[PDB]
Structures are given as structure tokens and as C-alpha cells.
């Protein structure tokens with residue numbers, strides 16, 4: 001069954017093209033709708049088609065955001081088009097990526113092994129770079145989690161996906177507190193704050209890092225109260241001040257009174273001290289105290305990636321990690337001093 | 348081998364007794380601590396010992412010492428043990444949970460027989476009627492917290508670690524209650540909610556037993572809300588206002604309500620569907636009270652003098668209401684207590 005549509009390219013000027021695809025199969029369901037895998041007739045390349053009901057009232061926010069993004073660590077929007085399906089549907093045609101951090105982490109966990117630190121470095125670095133890029137537009141993802149981190153195992157390339165929760169945050173304009181997924185929610189979201197910032201993504205990324213190092217989620221729980229107890233067990237009880245910077249009116253509630261557990265005793269003995277240091281600077285109560293994504297990229301944990309001699313275990317080169325644009329560096333241009341190693345500067 | 352402690356009876360005055368037990372095994376871990384199973388030397392009876400770090404006074408203990416009801420797990424004893432100090436709550440052990448039983452049916456591609464849906468939900472609503480009459484809200488109603496004896500079909504409500512006596516005008520944390528079972532006012536982060544959040548959670552359990560899977564799934568509040576809206580339709584401004592003000596002016600999926608009949612399988616009893624629709628209401632004050640739910644027609648079969656369990660035994664005691672239990676609406680007694688009781 002060959003399907004043919006006239007679709008609009010994700011990037012560049014509006015110049016629709018005939019696109020034919022076949023071998024359609026479902027690779028995902030959700031509240032949003034359905035994600036299909038398909039094969040393009042022209043090139044044989046695989047795509048993922050995210051199909052969602054289209055609101056008659058306004059432009060789709062996810063589409064508007066994805067048409068603005070162009071970055072090697074963000075899943076590319078190849079085309080989009082509208083169609084029927086019983087009401088009108090928006091179809092987002094994305095590059096298909098063969099793996100996710102969720103699935104890879106599960107494979108190691110079930111095999112009683114941990115992902116090699118070199119991959120933890122590579123994946124988390126690319127995640128932080130994707131965040132530096134979107135944040136520089138004021139855009140917050142709001143649902144960072146392993147299932148939304150696509151991986152190409154052969155090239156070790158990570159790509160951020162699912163911009164269905166993403167939003168341009170504006171200071172003084174309220175946002176829904178109920179975004180972000182179980183295990184990965186910043187404490188200010190748990191406290192129901194509506195005035196949060198892009199640093200909620202940095203907390204979520206910190207949970208992903210911790211999880212890759214531990215082999216399991218660092219703050220599990222099916223309720224916010226369970227998640228908060230797990231957080232308090234590590235960070236200790238938050239001060240009245242720390243509570244004020246997460247959500248006022250949570251000032252006077254009764255919290256568990258636990259002393260902070262030393263970060264080193266959280267992870268296995270073999271865990272590199274730089275990884276632990278990095279976790280502690282991401283997983284901070286006070287949102288403005290967390291590292292920015294660009295500062296995270298510059299962290300000592302990623303020094304190995306900047307070594308001119310670094311290679312993948314496959315033998316392959318690492319992906320391009322150093323070609324930062326002015327846009328990517330804009331939150332703190334002199335960080336390029338660290339971010340771009342001497343060998344990446346040879347003319 | 349054998350552990351001997353000096354434990355305080357859960358009810359009655361503080362007169363500690365020597366209590367010995369054996370065969371201790373772990374039956375659960377959580378954010379709170381650990382739950383052990385043990386066997387009492389005196390009676391051979393099985394108990395669950397919940398062990399939590401002790402701080403101020405323990406709210407869960409204070410609440411449980413006040414409760415005495417056949418559909419709430421009994422606090423037999425409590426005791427302290429050890430460089431910190433732990434509170435140990437000694438509970439009656441119950442062999443099964445609704446979580447585990449629903450899973451067994453789901454995995455077998457079968458539905459739990461409606462007679463058990465009636466029995467279990469009725470007893471849950473009785474337990475809620477009882478605790479709500481003290482002003483106490485459980486705040487974590489879910490299948491894992493619903494213990495079952497499969498031989499007698501008795502259900503007992505458990506885990507009061509989130510429970511609180513709600514006081515009008517005094518804020519409460521919004522972040523209680525578990526994924527799938529949270530009332531929309533909680534998802535919206537409300538701090539001024541009422542005991543009707545337990546009724547929403549109960550409605551989700553009822554729908555799940557009928558469907559064979561949770562009715563409002565999703566790992567984020569936004570996904571859960573979408574699933575809710577797909578069934579109830581988009582909430583109105585007023586309905587939002589009754590859930591949480593300032594969540595007005597937010598953009599919501601503009602979806603029309605789904606006919607409750609088409610939510611469930613064709614086999615589903617219409618009274619089950621009617622009851623569901625009266626529990627899962629956006630406006631918290633529009634939801635049925637637990638006592639009203641007990642009196643709903645869906646449970647009429649339980650009030651039949653000829654009703655029996657599928658294993659051949661009589662049903663457990665369903666009609667032994669106290670004044671306290673009926674206090675939200677005493678005239679319901681004429682429905683709740685049938686002529687043959």
C-alpha cells in the first residue's frame with residue numbers, strides 16, 4: 001500500500017513536494033495521537049510520522065516550534081502535511097532514529113550491567129547541547145526523559161525529540177505546572193509552581209544522568225510525595241529559603257527532617273567523581289543555582305570528549321561536538337574558551 | 348528466629364504487652380520504609396509490620412489509633428525499635444490486593460466478574476464514608492492500597508501514610524495521590540481541595556475494574572488531563588474555577604464529551620456506567636458522597652437476601668452501619684439496611 005501526499009518541507013521556504021511512502025506500521029501511541037514508521041519510496045529512508053488532531057482555533061504550537069529548530073542533536077522535521085482520519089489531522093514527518101536512551105538503559109539494566117561511562121559522557125553532552133540551543137530561543141522542552149532521547153547506536157549521535165509539551169517561556173506569564181513526567185519533575189513542578197523557568201529541563205537532564213550512572217531512576221515514586229521523600233533523602237530537607245525559590249505558600253507545610261546524604265555515597269564506588277560533582281550541580285533545589293546547559297557542556301566530566309585522541313569503542317570518530325554556532329554560545333560566549341578545544345581551532 | 352518486643356495495643360488504653368513473632372520476611376519497600384510479614388507466636392496469625400523512621404508526633408499513627416472498621420486494616424500493635432529510632436506499625440496481614448487480582452484477570456484476557464466489582468467497590472465506599480465522617484481524607488486511593496481476602500471477599504483499605512484531617516481554610520499539599528487516580532483539581536495543583544478527591548480516585552478504580560485497564564493513563568499530568576478530557580469533554584470556565592482558579596485563560600484541547608456508554612464494553616451493566624459518571628465529575632461538589640455511592644442501584648444485588656459468593660459462601664457483613672458511619676445522611680439507612688439484615 002503506497003501512500004502519496006503533497007507535503008511541506010520542515011525547513012526553508014514553503015515549497016511543497018510530492019512524497020510517497022509505504023510499509024506503514026505503528027511504533028507509538030499516546031494522549032497526543034499516533035506515531036507511525038514509514039519508508040520513503042524515493043530514497044528508502046525511514047521516517048516517523050507523528051499524527052495529531054488539529055485544533056480549528058489556532059496554529060499548532062509544536063509545529064511552529066519545530067519549524068524554527070535546526071540542530072544536529074534535535075530530531076529533524078523533514079515534512080508536514082494535513083489529512084483526514086475522522087476533523088483534520090496534522091502529520092509531522094520526522095527522521096526515524098533506531099534507538100532511545102530508555103531502551104538502551106533497559107538493556108543494560110536487565111543484563112545487570114551499566115552503560116559505559118564514555119557513552120554516558122557522549123549522550124549527556126549532546127543532550128545539554130540540544131538544551132543550550134533551544135533555551136537560547138527562550139524555548140523550554142518541559143518533558144525531558146529517556147524515552148524522548150533518540151540514539152543512533154552506530155554513530156553515538158543523540159537527538160532530542162517530542163516537542164508536544166515545549167513552550168516559549170515568558171517572565172511574568174503563567175505556565176501549567178502539570179507538565180513533565182514521573183521521576184523527572186523538578187521539585188518546583190511537584191510543588192505546583194506556575195512561574196518556573198527553563199532550568200526545569202536541567203533538573204530533568206540531571207535525573208537522566210543519575211539514572212544512567214545508577215542503573216535505575218534516582219527519585220522514583222508514583223506520587224509527588226514519594227518522589228519528594230526520595231529527593232529529600234539525597235538533598236536533605238529544603239530550607240525555608242529554598243522552598244521560597246521553588247514555591248511560596250509551601251513555606252509552612254510539614255516536611256520530613258532528614259540530613260543531606262553525601263553525594264558520593266549515592267553512587268557505586270567506581271563512579272567517576274566528576275560525574276558525581278556534575279549531578280550535584282544539576283540537582284539543586286534553588287532553580288537559579290543549577291548549571292545552565294552551556295555551563296554543563298563545559299563541565300570537567302566532559303573533558304575526555306575534548307581530547308583529540310578520543311574514539312568510540314566501535315573505532316569510529318565521535319560525532320561533531322565542537323561546531324557551536326553564535327546562537328548556541330549566546331548565553332555565555334566566553335565559554336567557547338573551554339568548549340572549543342585547541343585542535344578544533346586549527347585553520 | 349524469634350523476636351520479642353513490648354508493643355502497645357493499637358486500640359484501647361496504653362498498656363504495652365510482650366509480643367513475640369517469627370518468620371520475618373520482606374513483602375514491600377517504599378519511600379516510607381519497609382513492610383515485613385511476620386507470624387505471631389501466640390496465635391499463629393500473620394501480620395504486616397510497617398517500619399518507618401520516627402521524627403514531632405507521627406500523623407499516620409495518630410489517625411490509625413482512632414480507626415475501627417471492618418473495611419480498614421486493623422492496627423493490632425505499634426512499637427519502637429532501633430543510631431536512629433523507628434516506629435513499627437503491626438497490621439493484620441491480608442493475602443491479596445485489588446492491584447494483583449486485576450492484573451491476574453487482565454493477563455488472562457478476562458474481566459473480573461461484576462459481583463466482585465460490586466462487593467469490592469461497595470466496601471471501599473463504606474470505608475470512605477467512615478473515615479470522611481471524621482473529616483479524614485485518605486489522599487492515596489489506588490488498587491495497591493485495597494487489600495482483599497479472596498475466600499471471604501472482604502476488602503480492607505490500607506496505607507494511611509498520606510491521610511490527613513482536612514480543615515476548611517487551611518491549605519494542603521497538592522502533590523499527594525498517585526498516577527492514574529488523581530482528581531483534576533490535584534493535577535491543576537489545588538491546595539484547597541476536599542475529601543471528594545478520594546471519591547474521584549474510587550471512580551477511577553471502578554472504571555478500571557470494568558475496563559481491564561486504567562481509564563485515565565499517562566505519565567504526566569498533561570497526558571492524564573487529555574485522557575480525562577477525551578471522556579468528560581473540555582471543562583468549562585466554571586468547572587475550571589471550581590477545580591482551580593487562574594487555570595482559566597489557559598489553552599485546553601477543545602474536545603466534545605464522549606457518551607459514557609461507549610466508554611465501556613457492550614456487556615457492561617448500565618448501573619455501573621451511571622455510577623461511574625456520578626463519581627468522575629469535574630466539579631468536586633457534584634460528585635457522590637461515599638454513603639450516597641453505597642446506596643446507588645449498582646449495589647442493589649448486594650442487598651438481595653438470596654445473594655451468595657461464587658465460592659458458595661455468604662457475603663461478608665455489609666449492613667452493620669453505625670450512627671457515625673451514617674451521620675452524613677441518616678435517612679439513607681432505609682436503603683442501606685435491607686429488611687432481612
Ligand SMILES: O=C(Nc1cc(-c2ccc3ccncc3c2)ccn1)C1CC1
Pocket residue numbers: 027028030032035048050075094095096097098099100103150161162163164
Ligand atoms: O522509536 C524509535 N524511533 C523514533 C521515534 C520517534 C518518536 C517516537 C514517539 C514520539 C512520541 C511523541 N512525539 C514524538 C515521537 C517521536 C521519532 C523518530 N524515531 C525507535 C526505538 C524504536
Ligand SMILES: O=C(Nc1cc(-c2ccc3ccncc3c2)ccn1)C1CC1
Pocket residue numbers: 374375377379382395397420438439440441442443444447494505506507508
Ligand atoms: O501485601 C499483601 N498484604 C498486606 C499488605 C500490607 C501493606 C503493604 C504495603 C504497605 C505500604 C504502606 N503502608 C501500608 C502497607 C501495608 C498490609 C497487610 N497485608 C499481600 C499481597 C501479598
